[PDB]
Short mmCIF file of all heavy atoms in Angstrom, two decimals:
data_model
loop_
_atom_site.label_atom_id
_atom_site.label_comp_id
_atom_site.label_asym_id
_atom_site.label_seq_id
_atom_site.Cartn_x
_atom_site.Cartn_y
_atom_site.Cartn_z
N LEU Z 188 143.21 80.10 96.38
CA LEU Z 188 143.37 80.15 94.92
C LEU Z 188 144.47 79.12 94.42
O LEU Z 188 144.28 78.46 93.44
CB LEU Z 188 143.76 81.54 94.49
CG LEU Z 188 142.72 82.57 94.64
CD1 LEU Z 188 143.16 83.97 94.28
CD2 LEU Z 188 141.37 82.18 93.92
N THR Z 189 145.58 79.09 95.16
CA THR Z 189 146.65 78.16 94.77
C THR Z 189 146.33 76.72 95.14
O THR Z 189 147.04 75.78 94.67
CB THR Z 189 147.96 78.60 95.41
OG1 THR Z 189 147.88 78.59 96.89
CG2 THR Z 189 148.35 80.02 94.96
N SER Z 190 145.26 76.44 95.86
CA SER Z 190 144.87 75.02 96.14
C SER Z 190 143.91 74.48 95.16
O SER Z 190 143.70 73.28 95.06
CB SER Z 190 144.30 74.92 97.58
OG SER Z 190 142.90 75.33 97.51
N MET Z 191 143.31 75.30 94.23
CA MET Z 191 142.31 74.90 93.30
C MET Z 191 142.84 73.86 92.31
O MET Z 191 142.21 72.96 91.96
CB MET Z 191 141.64 76.06 92.63
CG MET Z 191 140.46 76.54 93.58
SD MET Z 191 139.88 78.14 92.97
CE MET Z 191 138.90 78.65 94.41
N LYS Z 192 144.06 74.03 91.91
CA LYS Z 192 144.76 73.09 90.98
C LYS Z 192 144.72 71.63 91.41
O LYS Z 192 144.81 70.75 90.66
CB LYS Z 192 146.16 73.54 90.60
CG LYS Z 192 147.15 73.44 91.78
CD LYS Z 192 148.64 73.79 91.31
CE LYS Z 192 148.87 75.18 91.40
NZ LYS Z 192 149.09 75.62 92.80
N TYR Z 193 144.61 71.43 92.75
CA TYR Z 193 144.64 70.08 93.28
C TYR Z 193 143.25 69.37 93.24
O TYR Z 193 143.20 68.19 93.69
CB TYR Z 193 145.16 70.07 94.70
CG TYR Z 193 146.57 70.66 94.85
CD1 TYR Z 193 146.81 71.81 95.51
CD2 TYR Z 193 147.62 70.03 94.21
CE1 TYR Z 193 148.09 72.35 95.64
CE2 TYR Z 193 148.92 70.60 94.24
CZ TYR Z 193 149.10 71.74 95.04
OH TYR Z 193 150.43 72.23 95.09
N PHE Z 194 142.18 70.08 92.89
CA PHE Z 194 140.85 69.38 92.85
C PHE Z 194 139.99 69.90 91.75
O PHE Z 194 138.80 69.40 91.66
CB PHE Z 194 140.12 69.55 94.22
CG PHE Z 194 139.72 70.88 94.68
CD1 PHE Z 194 138.41 71.38 94.49
CD2 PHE Z 194 140.57 71.71 95.44
CE1 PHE Z 194 137.97 72.57 95.02
CE2 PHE Z 194 140.16 72.96 95.91
CZ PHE Z 194 138.85 73.36 95.69
N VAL Z 195 140.40 70.86 90.93
CA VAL Z 195 139.65 71.47 89.84
C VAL Z 195 140.27 71.25 88.47
O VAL Z 195 141.55 71.41 88.34
CB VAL Z 195 139.59 73.03 90.15
CG1 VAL Z 195 138.96 73.79 88.94
CG2 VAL Z 195 138.75 73.34 91.44
N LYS Z 196 139.51 70.89 87.53
CA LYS Z 196 139.95 70.72 86.15
C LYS Z 196 139.02 71.67 85.34
O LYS Z 196 137.80 71.86 85.71
CB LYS Z 196 139.81 69.31 85.62
CG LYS Z 196 140.86 68.33 86.10
CD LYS Z 196 142.30 68.68 85.58
CE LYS Z 196 143.32 67.74 86.08
NZ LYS Z 196 143.10 66.34 85.55
N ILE Z 197 139.54 72.34 84.30
CA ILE Z 197 138.80 73.22 83.47
C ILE Z 197 138.91 72.83 81.99
O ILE Z 197 139.82 72.09 81.62
CB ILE Z 197 139.21 74.68 83.69
CG1 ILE Z 197 140.58 75.02 83.15
CG2 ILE Z 197 139.08 75.13 85.17
CD1 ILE Z 197 140.84 76.42 82.97
N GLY Z 198 137.97 73.28 81.24
CA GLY Z 198 137.98 73.07 79.76
C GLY Z 198 136.74 73.62 79.12
O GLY Z 198 136.02 74.48 79.65
N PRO Z 199 136.40 73.05 78.01
CA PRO Z 199 135.14 73.50 77.35
C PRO Z 199 133.91 73.07 78.17
O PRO Z 199 133.92 72.07 78.88
CB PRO Z 199 135.14 72.80 75.95
CG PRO Z 199 136.06 71.59 76.21
CD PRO Z 199 137.10 72.03 77.23
N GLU Z 200 132.74 73.76 77.93
CA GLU Z 200 131.51 73.42 78.61
C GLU Z 200 131.11 72.00 77.99
O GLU Z 200 131.24 71.68 76.81
CB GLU Z 200 130.47 74.41 78.38
CG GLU Z 200 130.55 75.64 79.30
CD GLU Z 200 130.21 75.37 80.71
OE1 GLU Z 200 129.04 75.46 81.06
OE2 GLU Z 200 131.10 74.99 81.54
N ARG Z 201 130.77 71.11 78.88
CA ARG Z 201 130.41 69.72 78.47
C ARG Z 201 129.06 69.30 79.09
O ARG Z 201 128.53 69.95 79.99
CB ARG Z 201 131.50 68.82 79.01
CG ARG Z 201 132.77 68.99 78.22
CD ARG Z 201 133.90 68.13 78.80
NE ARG Z 201 135.15 68.37 78.02
CZ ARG Z 201 135.53 67.61 77.01
NH1 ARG Z 201 134.73 66.57 76.59
NH2 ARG Z 201 136.58 67.85 76.36
N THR Z 202 128.56 68.18 78.59
CA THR Z 202 127.32 67.61 79.16
C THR Z 202 127.68 66.30 79.91
O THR Z 202 128.74 65.73 79.78
CB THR Z 202 126.23 67.44 78.15
OG1 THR Z 202 126.54 66.37 77.33
CG2 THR Z 202 126.02 68.73 77.29
N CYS Z 203 126.76 65.90 80.84
CA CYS Z 203 126.91 64.75 81.63
C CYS Z 203 126.89 63.48 80.77
O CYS Z 203 126.29 63.45 79.69
CB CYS Z 203 125.75 64.66 82.59
SG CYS Z 203 125.81 63.20 83.76
N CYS Z 204 127.66 62.40 81.22
CA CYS Z 204 127.73 61.12 80.47
C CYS Z 204 126.46 60.30 80.62
O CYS Z 204 126.09 59.60 79.69
CB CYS Z 204 128.96 60.31 80.89
SG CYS Z 204 128.83 59.73 82.56
N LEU Z 205 125.66 60.56 81.68
CA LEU Z 205 124.37 59.85 81.88
C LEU Z 205 123.09 60.66 81.66
O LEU Z 205 122.05 60.09 81.63
CB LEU Z 205 124.35 59.24 83.28
CG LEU Z 205 125.38 58.07 83.51
CD1 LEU Z 205 125.57 57.77 85.03
CD2 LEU Z 205 125.05 56.79 82.79
N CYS Z 206 123.28 61.99 81.46
CA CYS Z 206 122.02 62.82 81.19
C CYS Z 206 122.37 64.12 80.41
O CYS Z 206 123.47 64.25 79.96
CB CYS Z 206 121.29 63.07 82.53
SG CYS Z 206 122.07 64.48 83.48
N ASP Z 207 121.35 65.02 80.17
CA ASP Z 207 121.44 66.24 79.46
C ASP Z 207 122.02 67.42 80.27
O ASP Z 207 122.19 68.50 79.63
CB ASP Z 207 120.11 66.54 78.77
CG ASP Z 207 119.72 65.74 77.61
OD1 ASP Z 207 120.65 65.43 76.81
OD2 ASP Z 207 118.53 65.34 77.49
N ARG Z 208 122.16 67.33 81.54
CA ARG Z 208 122.66 68.41 82.36
C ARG Z 208 124.11 68.78 82.11
O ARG Z 208 124.89 67.96 81.61
CB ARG Z 208 122.49 68.11 83.86
CG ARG Z 208 121.04 67.83 84.29
CD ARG Z 208 121.09 67.37 85.76
NE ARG Z 208 119.76 67.03 86.31
CZ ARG Z 208 119.26 65.88 86.34
NH1 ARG Z 208 119.86 64.79 85.84
NH2 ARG Z 208 118.08 65.66 86.88
N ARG Z 209 124.57 70.01 82.35
CA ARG Z 209 125.99 70.40 82.13
C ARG Z 209 126.79 69.71 83.20
O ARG Z 209 126.39 69.39 84.26
CB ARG Z 209 126.15 71.98 82.16
CG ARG Z 209 126.36 72.50 83.56
CD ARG Z 209 126.66 74.10 83.57
NE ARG Z 209 128.07 74.41 83.49
CZ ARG Z 209 128.95 74.41 84.55
NH1 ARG Z 209 128.50 73.92 85.77
NH2 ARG Z 209 130.19 74.75 84.40
#
Side-chain angles (χ1 to χ4, degrees):
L188 293 178
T189 64
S190 81
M191 275 168 196
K192 71 174 86 75
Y193 302 117
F194 67 97
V195 171
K196 284 295 181 63
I197 72 162
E200 281 286 274
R201 290 175 180 268
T202 74
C203 181
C204 66
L205 293 165
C206 81
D207 285 320
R208 304 171 178 95
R209 88 179 268 279

